[PDB]
Short mmCIF file of C-alpha atoms and ligand atoms in Angstrom, two decimals:
data_model
loop_
_atom_site.label_atom_id
_atom_site.label_comp_id
_atom_site.label_asym_id
_atom_site.label_seq_id
_atom_site.Cartn_x
_atom_site.Cartn_y
_atom_site.Cartn_z
CA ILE A 1 0.00 0.00 0.00
CA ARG A 2 2.82 2.37 0.91
CA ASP A 3 4.94 0.98 -1.94
CA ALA A 4 2.06 1.39 -4.39
CA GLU A 5 1.88 5.06 -3.38
CA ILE A 6 5.49 5.81 -4.34
CA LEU A 7 5.27 4.37 -7.85
CA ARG A 8 2.03 6.31 -8.36
CA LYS A 9 3.76 9.38 -6.92
CA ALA A 10 6.88 8.81 -9.04
CA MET A 11 4.75 8.50 -12.20
CA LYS A 12 2.35 11.35 -11.42
CA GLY A 13 2.77 14.68 -13.16
CA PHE A 14 4.95 15.55 -16.12
CA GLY A 15 7.83 13.13 -16.55
CA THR A 16 8.86 10.21 -14.36
CA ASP A 17 11.01 9.85 -11.26
CA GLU A 18 12.92 6.81 -12.46
CA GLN A 19 15.14 6.74 -9.36
CA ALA A 20 12.20 6.24 -6.98
CA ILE A 21 10.87 3.42 -9.17
CA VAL A 22 14.22 1.62 -8.94
CA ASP A 23 14.57 2.09 -5.17
CA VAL A 24 11.30 0.16 -4.70
CA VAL A 25 11.43 -2.55 -7.36
CA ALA A 26 15.08 -3.46 -6.73
CA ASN A 27 14.71 -3.71 -2.93
CA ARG A 28 11.59 -5.90 -2.99
CA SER A 29 11.30 -9.64 -3.65
CA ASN A 30 9.18 -11.02 -6.47
CA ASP A 31 6.52 -12.14 -3.99
CA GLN A 32 6.53 -8.58 -2.63
CA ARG A 33 6.42 -7.10 -6.13
CA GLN A 34 3.22 -9.09 -6.74
CA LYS A 35 1.66 -7.74 -3.54
CA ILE A 36 2.60 -4.21 -4.64
CA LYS A 37 0.89 -4.89 -7.97
CA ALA A 38 -2.21 -5.96 -6.02
CA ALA A 39 -2.09 -3.08 -3.53
CA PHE A 40 -1.80 -0.71 -6.49
CA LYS A 41 -4.92 -1.99 -8.26
CA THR A 42 -7.01 -1.79 -5.09
CA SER A 43 -5.84 1.71 -4.18
CA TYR A 44 -6.40 3.34 -7.56
CA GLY A 45 -8.35 0.99 -9.82
CA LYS A 46 -5.62 0.99 -12.46
CA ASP A 47 -3.13 -1.65 -13.52
CA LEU A 48 0.41 -0.81 -12.47
CA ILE A 49 2.08 -2.67 -15.36
CA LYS A 50 0.16 -0.63 -17.93
CA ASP A 51 0.89 2.65 -16.13
CA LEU A 52 4.54 1.59 -16.07
CA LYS A 53 4.48 0.84 -19.80
CA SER A 54 3.16 4.35 -20.46
CA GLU A 55 5.83 6.19 -18.44
CA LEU A 56 8.86 3.94 -19.05
CA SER A 57 10.49 2.92 -22.33
CA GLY A 58 13.24 0.86 -23.91
CA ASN A 59 15.49 -1.41 -21.89
CA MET A 60 14.29 0.26 -18.69
CA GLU A 61 10.71 -0.75 -19.50
CA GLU A 62 11.45 -4.37 -20.41
CA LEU A 63 13.70 -4.85 -17.36
CA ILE A 64 10.97 -3.53 -15.07
CA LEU A 65 8.34 -5.58 -16.92
CA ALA A 66 10.43 -8.72 -16.40
CA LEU A 67 10.83 -7.92 -12.69
CA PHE A 68 7.08 -7.86 -11.99
CA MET A 69 6.22 -11.15 -13.68
CA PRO A 70 5.98 -14.21 -11.41
CA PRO A 71 9.04 -16.41 -12.00
CA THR A 72 7.00 -19.32 -13.37
CA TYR A 73 4.84 -17.14 -15.62
CA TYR A 74 7.92 -15.26 -16.85
CA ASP A 75 9.56 -18.49 -18.04
CA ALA A 76 6.32 -19.64 -19.67
CA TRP A 77 5.94 -16.21 -21.29
CA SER A 78 9.59 -16.40 -22.37
CA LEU A 79 8.88 -19.78 -23.98
CA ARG A 80 5.76 -18.53 -25.80
CA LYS A 81 7.57 -15.47 -27.17
CA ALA A 82 10.44 -17.70 -28.32
CA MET A 83 8.05 -19.76 -30.49
CA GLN A 84 5.57 -17.04 -31.48
CA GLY A 85 5.16 -16.65 -35.23
CA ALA A 86 7.58 -17.77 -37.86
CA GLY A 87 11.12 -18.43 -36.71
CA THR A 88 12.40 -19.76 -33.39
CA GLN A 89 15.06 -18.66 -30.93
CA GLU A 90 16.15 -22.11 -29.83
CA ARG A 91 18.78 -20.48 -27.61
CA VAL A 92 15.93 -19.34 -25.38
CA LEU A 93 14.36 -22.80 -25.35
CA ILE A 94 17.71 -24.27 -24.29
CA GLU A 95 18.40 -21.66 -21.58
CA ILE A 96 15.08 -22.39 -19.74
CA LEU A 97 14.11 -25.95 -20.69
CA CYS A 98 17.61 -27.38 -20.09
CA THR A 99 18.44 -25.49 -16.87
CA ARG A 100 15.18 -25.44 -14.89
CA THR A 101 14.59 -28.17 -12.33
CA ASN A 102 11.78 -30.73 -12.24
CA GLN A 103 9.71 -28.57 -9.89
CA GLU A 104 10.18 -25.47 -12.05
CA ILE A 105 9.40 -27.34 -15.27
CA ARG A 106 6.09 -28.73 -13.99
CA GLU A 107 4.85 -25.28 -12.93
CA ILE A 108 5.63 -23.94 -16.42
CA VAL A 109 3.64 -26.73 -18.09
CA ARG A 110 0.75 -25.91 -15.75
CA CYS A 111 1.02 -22.13 -16.17
CA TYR A 112 1.51 -22.40 -19.95
CA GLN A 113 -1.83 -24.21 -20.18
CA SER A 114 -3.84 -22.10 -17.72
CA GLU A 115 -2.66 -18.80 -19.26
CA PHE A 116 -2.43 -19.23 -23.05
CA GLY A 117 -4.70 -22.26 -23.47
CA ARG A 118 -1.93 -24.03 -25.37
CA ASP A 119 0.00 -27.26 -24.87
CA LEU A 120 3.66 -26.48 -24.19
CA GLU A 121 4.98 -29.75 -25.62
CA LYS A 122 2.70 -29.51 -28.67
CA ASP A 123 4.11 -26.03 -29.30
CA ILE A 124 7.65 -27.43 -29.03
CA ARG A 125 7.06 -30.18 -31.60
CA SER A 126 5.67 -27.69 -34.12
CA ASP A 127 8.43 -25.06 -33.88
CA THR A 128 11.24 -27.64 -33.78
CA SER A 129 12.11 -31.04 -35.27
CA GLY A 130 14.98 -33.49 -35.35
CA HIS A 131 16.79 -34.63 -32.22
CA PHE A 132 16.35 -31.14 -30.75
CA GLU A 133 12.57 -31.57 -30.61
CA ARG A 134 13.19 -34.88 -28.84
CA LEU A 135 15.60 -33.25 -26.37
CA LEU A 136 13.24 -30.37 -25.57
CA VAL A 137 10.35 -32.83 -25.22
CA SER A 138 12.28 -34.87 -22.65
CA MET A 139 13.06 -31.60 -20.88
CA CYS A 140 9.34 -30.76 -20.83
CA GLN A 141 8.56 -33.95 -18.90
CA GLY A 142 10.28 -32.51 -15.82
CA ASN A 143 11.08 -36.11 -14.90
CA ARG A 144 14.83 -36.14 -14.21
CA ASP A 145 16.03 -38.59 -11.58
CA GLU A 146 16.13 -36.92 -8.18
CA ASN A 147 18.25 -39.31 -6.11
CA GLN A 148 21.37 -37.25 -5.44
CA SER A 149 23.46 -40.26 -4.43
CA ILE A 150 25.99 -41.62 -6.91
CA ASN A 151 25.40 -45.04 -8.44
CA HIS A 152 28.89 -46.11 -9.49
CA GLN A 153 28.04 -49.20 -11.56
CA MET A 154 25.48 -47.06 -13.43
CA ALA A 155 28.03 -44.31 -14.09
CA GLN A 156 30.46 -46.89 -15.49
CA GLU A 157 27.90 -48.64 -17.71
CA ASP A 158 26.34 -45.36 -18.86
CA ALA A 159 29.69 -43.89 -19.89
CA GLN A 160 30.60 -47.05 -21.80
CA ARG A 161 27.26 -46.76 -23.60
CA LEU A 162 27.86 -43.08 -24.34
CA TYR A 163 31.32 -44.11 -25.55
CA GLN A 164 29.88 -46.76 -27.88
CA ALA A 165 27.02 -44.55 -29.11
CA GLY A 166 29.19 -41.67 -30.32
CA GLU A 167 32.96 -42.11 -30.55
CA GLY A 168 32.94 -45.90 -30.78
CA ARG A 169 31.03 -45.81 -34.07
CA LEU A 170 30.56 -43.89 -37.29
CA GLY A 171 27.57 -41.65 -36.99
CA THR A 172 25.92 -41.35 -33.60
CA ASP A 173 23.20 -43.11 -31.59
CA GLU A 174 21.51 -39.90 -30.51
CA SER A 175 18.72 -41.28 -28.30
CA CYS A 176 21.39 -42.79 -26.06
CA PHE A 177 22.71 -39.29 -25.35
CA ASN A 178 19.09 -38.17 -25.02
CA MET A 179 18.40 -40.94 -22.50
CA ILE A 180 21.28 -40.54 -20.05
CA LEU A 181 21.56 -36.76 -20.30
CA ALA A 182 17.80 -36.33 -19.75
CA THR A 183 17.14 -39.06 -17.15
CA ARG A 184 20.23 -39.05 -14.92
CA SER A 185 20.47 -36.81 -11.87
CA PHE A 186 23.05 -34.04 -11.83
CA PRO A 187 25.53 -35.74 -9.43
CA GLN A 188 25.02 -38.93 -11.44
CA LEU A 189 25.84 -37.13 -14.69
CA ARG A 190 28.96 -35.79 -12.97
CA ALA A 191 30.04 -39.35 -12.14
CA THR A 192 29.21 -40.42 -15.70
CA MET A 193 31.54 -37.76 -17.12
CA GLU A 194 34.30 -38.77 -14.70
CA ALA A 195 34.02 -42.40 -15.78
CA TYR A 196 33.88 -41.26 -19.42
CA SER A 197 37.12 -39.27 -19.15
CA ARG A 198 39.29 -42.24 -18.16
CA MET A 199 37.81 -44.79 -20.57
CA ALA A 200 37.54 -42.50 -23.61
CA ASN A 201 40.69 -40.45 -22.87
CA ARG A 202 38.66 -37.39 -23.91
CA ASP A 203 35.98 -35.67 -21.86
CA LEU A 204 32.28 -36.02 -22.59
CA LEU A 205 31.81 -32.38 -23.63
CA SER A 206 34.32 -32.60 -26.49
CA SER A 207 32.73 -35.81 -27.81
CA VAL A 208 29.36 -34.05 -27.87
CA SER A 209 30.94 -31.33 -30.00
CA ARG A 210 32.32 -34.02 -32.33
CA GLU A 211 29.32 -36.34 -32.79
CA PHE A 212 26.67 -33.59 -32.53
CA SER A 213 26.11 -30.15 -34.01
CA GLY A 214 23.46 -27.42 -34.11
CA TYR A 215 21.03 -26.86 -31.27
CA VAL A 216 21.21 -30.47 -30.09
CA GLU A 217 24.91 -30.02 -29.35
CA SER A 218 24.18 -26.70 -27.65
CA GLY A 219 21.35 -28.28 -25.67
CA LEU A 220 23.36 -31.34 -24.65
CA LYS A 221 26.38 -29.31 -23.58
CA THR A 222 24.02 -27.08 -21.58
CA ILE A 223 22.77 -30.01 -19.48
CA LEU A 224 26.32 -31.28 -18.92
CA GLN A 225 27.68 -27.81 -18.16
CA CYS A 226 24.84 -27.37 -15.66
CA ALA A 227 25.57 -30.73 -14.02
CA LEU A 228 29.12 -29.51 -13.37
CA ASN A 229 28.43 -25.88 -12.40
CA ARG A 230 25.05 -24.36 -13.27
CA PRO A 231 25.99 -20.83 -12.06
CA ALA A 232 29.08 -20.91 -14.28
CA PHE A 233 26.98 -21.73 -17.36
CA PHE A 234 24.88 -18.60 -16.79
CA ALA A 235 28.03 -16.55 -16.14
CA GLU A 236 29.31 -17.57 -19.58
CA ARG A 237 25.91 -16.67 -21.08
CA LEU A 238 26.03 -13.24 -19.44
CA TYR A 239 29.64 -12.73 -20.58
CA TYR A 240 28.63 -13.50 -24.17
CA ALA A 241 25.72 -11.07 -23.88
CA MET A 242 27.85 -7.97 -23.27
CA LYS A 243 31.00 -8.93 -25.19
CA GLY A 244 31.40 -7.13 -28.49
CA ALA A 245 29.96 -3.78 -29.46
CA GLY A 246 26.56 -3.36 -27.83
CA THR A 247 24.56 -5.62 -25.56
CA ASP A 248 22.22 -8.57 -25.97
CA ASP A 249 19.77 -6.85 -23.65
CA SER A 250 17.10 -9.56 -23.88
CA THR A 251 19.46 -12.18 -22.46
CA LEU A 252 21.23 -9.96 -19.91
CA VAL A 253 17.85 -8.91 -18.51
CA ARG A 254 16.40 -12.43 -18.61
CA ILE A 255 19.33 -14.08 -16.81
CA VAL A 256 19.68 -11.37 -14.16
CA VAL A 257 15.93 -11.43 -13.42
CA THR A 258 15.28 -15.18 -13.53
CA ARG A 259 18.27 -16.13 -11.36
CA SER A 260 18.11 -13.03 -9.13
CA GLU A 261 16.48 -14.90 -6.24
CA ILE A 262 17.96 -18.33 -7.07
CA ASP A 263 21.73 -18.48 -7.57
CA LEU A 264 22.80 -15.00 -8.71
CA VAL A 265 25.50 -14.75 -6.04
CA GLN A 266 27.19 -17.95 -7.20
CA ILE A 267 26.89 -16.62 -10.77
CA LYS A 268 28.82 -13.50 -9.73
CA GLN A 269 31.57 -15.44 -7.94
CA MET A 270 31.86 -17.78 -10.93
CA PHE A 271 31.86 -14.88 -13.40
CA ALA A 272 34.58 -13.15 -11.38
CA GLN A 273 36.83 -16.22 -11.55
CA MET A 274 36.25 -17.13 -15.20
CA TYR A 275 36.88 -13.55 -16.34
CA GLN A 276 39.04 -11.75 -13.70
CA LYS A 277 36.36 -9.06 -13.73
CA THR A 278 33.18 -8.67 -11.70
CA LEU A 279 29.80 -9.09 -13.34
CA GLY A 280 29.08 -5.57 -12.09
CA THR A 281 32.07 -4.11 -13.93
CA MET A 282 31.02 -5.74 -17.22
CA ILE A 283 27.49 -4.38 -16.85
CA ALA A 284 28.53 -0.87 -15.79
CA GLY A 285 30.59 -0.60 -18.97
CA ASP A 286 27.87 -2.01 -21.23
CA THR A 287 24.75 -0.23 -19.88
CA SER A 288 23.72 3.31 -18.96
CA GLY A 289 20.79 5.38 -17.70
CA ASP A 290 18.41 4.15 -15.04
CA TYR A 291 18.48 0.77 -16.82
CA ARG A 292 22.04 0.42 -15.52
CA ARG A 293 21.05 1.63 -12.04
CA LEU A 294 18.38 -1.09 -11.85
CA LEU A 295 20.71 -3.84 -13.09
CA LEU A 296 23.43 -2.91 -10.59
CA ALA A 297 20.89 -2.65 -7.76
CA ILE A 298 19.55 -6.14 -8.50
CA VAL A 299 23.06 -7.67 -8.46
CA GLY A 300 23.65 -4.99 -5.78
CA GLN A 301 24.84 -5.23 -2.18
CA1 CA B 401 3.30 -2.01 0.96
CA1 CA B 402 2.63 11.48 -15.88
CA1 CA B 403 12.65 11.82 -14.83
CA1 CA B 404 9.78 -6.45 4.15
CA1 CA B 405 6.46 2.81 -23.25
CA1 CA B 406 6.05 -20.75 -34.78
CA1 CA B 407 16.33 -19.99 -34.99
CA1 CA B 408 7.29 -30.56 -36.67
CA1 CA B 409 29.58 -4.71 -25.08
#
């Protein structure tokens, strides 16, 4: 109620107080940002998101818009917009569908139905094909093994099978990589890759690059890279987003927002090590305006 007043106050009159908007949104959780959305509608009978769309613009607007969406609905929205129309940004389908957990995936499948009236998996099969469709479909099941204990005989056998399905033959037996990489738990996949390094004399990630290509290779490496160090995978994705002239603002916003309340800290510590440069320094050089002030506040203190 008090928070809803400030945003209304900061939008009232000519112009906008963008600093006040940041001081509220960046210092409030997502659960709290939903209760501010609700307190706003009751106090004034207007939607806050629409009033924010009228008085913000550009990267500031989309970063604030992302920050007010519930985490589940945001992912589901992000998946719909990645398939909407002709074309597909399979990078977005990999970043979500290959990195979210079983719990997160099942909420998306529920929210995707109850909000757009569409079948998530059905949408995936139409916008994709090949072994990538199969990989994303497995991802959509949200059915990865959850036992976090290591089964050693399984790790051995699995690696041997992965060895025989790719390197040990001409061509590749893709569904074998689909099976283990989509069914095995993350500590189990880590044991699989350790068994695969000694027997193959070449780590599992390189073999994926050799026997696979395209978005399947990207998707498969994503799962493996997440099994090793999921925060480090995002760090690399954020590094790619701001390297070069300009910024991939869609990605930089999406990763900062979606992982802000999950594992952002570990992403920063990873990013610092992999690049000898804080994630804040990279952003502060690549962004400006209030849009920068919001991004730094979210990483923050
Ligand atoms: Ca309040
Ligand atoms: Ca105004
Ligand atoms: Ca202003
Ligand atoms: Ca509080
Ligand atoms: Ca606008
Ligand atoms: Ca389409
Ligand atoms: Ca594409
Ligand atoms: Ca198809
Ligand atoms: Ca740049």
